[PDB]
UniProtKB/TrEMBL annotation, chains A, B:
Family from the record: Belongs to the protease inhibitor I3 (leguminous Kunitz-type inhibitor) family.
GO MF entry, a single one: serine-type endopeptidase inhibitor activity
TM stretches of this protein: none
Source taxonomy: Eukaryota, Viridiplantae, Streptophyta, Embryophyta, Tracheophyta
Residues shown, of full length: 34 to 218 of 218
Keyword Signal listed: yes
Alphabetically ordered keywords of this record: Disulfide bond, Protease inhibitor, Serine protease inhibitor, Signal
Protein name: KTI-A protein
Length: 185, 185
C-alpha cells in the first residue's frame, strides 16, 4: 500500500510551492470557486470566512497552498490549507484555514481562517477522492483527542456547504460533500 | 445482546427520578467528588465549571440526575447530565452539563454547564465500565455530524481531569479517565 498523490486539473501532482484555485465539479449556477470572504456575524477585524461563489461565471477563487507534514501532498493525510494572497498588516494572521466552534444554528462547525500550521488543533484537513466526481476536503478537528475506536483515534468529517446570509459557506456536513478540483495558477 | 443498566454504590439501578453524587474510586487525596464551581476565566454570570474536589475529606459533591433518551439508564447510551440543586433566578440555565469549545491551552474541551436536554449538540454523555475500576463518563459531542467510520458515525472521548488554576477540572482526555461511582442521595 503506497500513498497516492493528489493531482491538479492538468494531471501534475500538487506542489507545496505552488498555488491552486479550489474549483467545483458543478457548472454554471451549480459552480463557484472557494474564496476568502467576510462572515456576516464575525467580530474578526479581517475577513475570516471560507466561502464559494454562487456561480462560476464571475470572479475566480482565492488561491491556496497546501502544507503537508511530509514533503509530499498525498490523499488521506493531514495537511494545512492557507489562502495565498497579499494582506493588510492587520490581517496577515487570518489566512490559514481552520474549523470554528460548534455553530448551534447550523449544528456544525464552519470553515474559517485564523488557523495555525503544524499544530494538533482545528487546522488539519485531508484531501480524498470523492464518492461521485473528483476530490473532497475533509476536516479532522481535535487531533489532540482520542476518538474512541475511530480510524486512527481520529474524528474526521466531510466538508460541504451551508447557506449563511445567502452565501455558500463551507462547513462540515454529512451528505453532499463539495466535489472539487485544483487548478494551479 | 441486551442493554446493561448502570448501578449505584448500593447495587440498585439508576433512577431518572433519583439524584447521585459522582464520587471517585480514589481515596483521600486521590479522591474528591464532582461539583459545580466557578471557572476562573469564565464570563458567565453563573458558576459553569464541572470540577472535582482535591480530597474526599471535605465537602460532598453536587448531586446530579441523568436523562436518557429512553426511560432507562443503560451503559453505552447517550444521556444528559444535570446538577440537581436549587439556584438563583439568574443561574437556572447553568445546570445542564455540556462540553465547551476547544481550549487551546489544554488542547481539549472542558466540561461546563449551560447545556440542553434532548438535543443533538454538546450535551450528550455516556456511562461505561472503566478499564480499571468502576465507571467512566464519556463525552460524545457533535452528534449532528457524521464521524467517518466511527462507531455509529459518532465521535466519543473519555472524560478525565486537567488542572486549571490549581483545581481539578473535568475534561476530555486520552489516558487516566476519571474512575467514578454513583452514590444516591
Amino acid at each position: 500500500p503506497l500513498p497516492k498523490p493528489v493531482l491538479d486539473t492538468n494531471g501534475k501532482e500538487l506542489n507545496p510551492d505552488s498555488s491552486y484555485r479550489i474549483i467545483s465539479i458543478g457548472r454554471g449556477a451549480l459552480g463557484g470557486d472557494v474564496y476568502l470572504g467576510k462572515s456576516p456575524n464575525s467580530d474578526a477585524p479581517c475577513p475570516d470566512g471560507v466561502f464559494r461563489y454562487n456561480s462560476d461565471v464571475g470572479p475566480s477563487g482565492t488561491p491556496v497552498r497546501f502544507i503537508p507534514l511530509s514533503t509530499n501532498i498525498f490523499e488521506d493525510q493531514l495537511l494545512n490549507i492557507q489562502f495565498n494572497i497579499p494582506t493588510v498588516k492587520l490581517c496577515v494572521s487570518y489566512t490559514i484555514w481552520k474549523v470554528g466552534n460548534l455553530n448551534a444554528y447550523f449544528r456544525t462547525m464552519l470553515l474559517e481562517t485564523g488557523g495555525t500550521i503544524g499544530q494538533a488543533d482545528n487546522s488539519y484537513f485531508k484531501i480524498v477522492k470523492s464518492s461521485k466526481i473528483g476530490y473532497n476536503l475533509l476536516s479532522c478537528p481535535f487531533t489532540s483527542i482520542i476518538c474512541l475506536r475511530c480510524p486512527e483515534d481520529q474524528f474526521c468529517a466531510k466538508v460541504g456547504v451551508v447557506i449563511q446570509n445567502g452565501k455558500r459557506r463551507l462547513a462540515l456536513v454529512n451528505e453532499n460533500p463539495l466535489d472539487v478540483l485544483f487548478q494551479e495558477v
